């Protein structure tokens, strides 16, 4: 055939892929973390937005650190052969490199490692997107008038 460039990811597989949304609103009293009012609005908006992009959206609410890891592990072990990509949205409290389960922190690296090119072969060469709504520290931006 003619000249082939391959500058864009192949996104015409039978399925666009999964869009896993972890929506943590309520945390265990033991952690002292406050409820995240308004997060349900985010979760619903994401479900509708990615639904229209043809993603298989799966939502999970208030997951413990154990459940978050179990969820990610299970999903990474699925056969993604017919899926073009993978999307994971994390909505919770957090700090640099950390996302909070309802009973404690989870290293982002632990979550993403399940999807490494050598650990999830059916996603090798495919875009793996992680969308994170959480703090990354305690700095405040005072901004500048334009």
């Amino acid at each position: 055939s003619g000249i082939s460039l391959d500058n864009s990811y192949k996104m015409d597989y039978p399925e666009m892929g999964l869009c896993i949304i972890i929506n943590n609103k309520n945390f265990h009293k033991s952690t002292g973390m406050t409820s995240r009012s308004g997060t349900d609005v985010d979760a619903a908006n994401l479900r509708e937005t990615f639904r229209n992009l043809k993603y298989e959206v799966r939502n999970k609410n208030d997951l413990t650190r154990e459940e978050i890891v179990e969820l990610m592990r299970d999903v990474s072990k699925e056969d993604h052969s017919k899926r073009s990509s993978f999307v994971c949205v994390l909505l919770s409290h957090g700090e640099e490199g950390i996302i909070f389960g309802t009973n404690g922190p989870v290293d982002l690296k632990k979550i993403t490692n399940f999807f490494r090119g050598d650990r999830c072969r059916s996603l090798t060469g495919k875009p793996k997107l992680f969308i994170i709504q959480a703090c990354r520290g305690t700095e405040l931006d005072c901004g500048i008038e334009t």
Binding site: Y9, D42, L53, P127, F130, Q133, R136, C142
Partner: protein, 103 residues
Amino acid sequence: ASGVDDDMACHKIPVEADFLYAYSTAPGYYSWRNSKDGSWFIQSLCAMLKQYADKLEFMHILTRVNRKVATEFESFSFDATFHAKKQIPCIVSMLTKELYFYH
């Protein structure tokens, strides 16, 4: 030209390749959320995807999200310490190709 670190017989890619992290805020900063309308970042991300997913490449969509959050939002708080603050999302790309949600 020739060298010891290029043109390998067996092709491999980094295990960290093809990942994209769309962070709501810059490294080391707080992230803002409206108790009623949701987080500034997710609000904006969904709006830009809804308007440009069938028109622009992903990085360009995320750049629009960056501009929307940076220009349109400013915090309100009865606590002076957390009042009138700004936010800039942070795109971290280890992608190796352009990404379009349409084909």
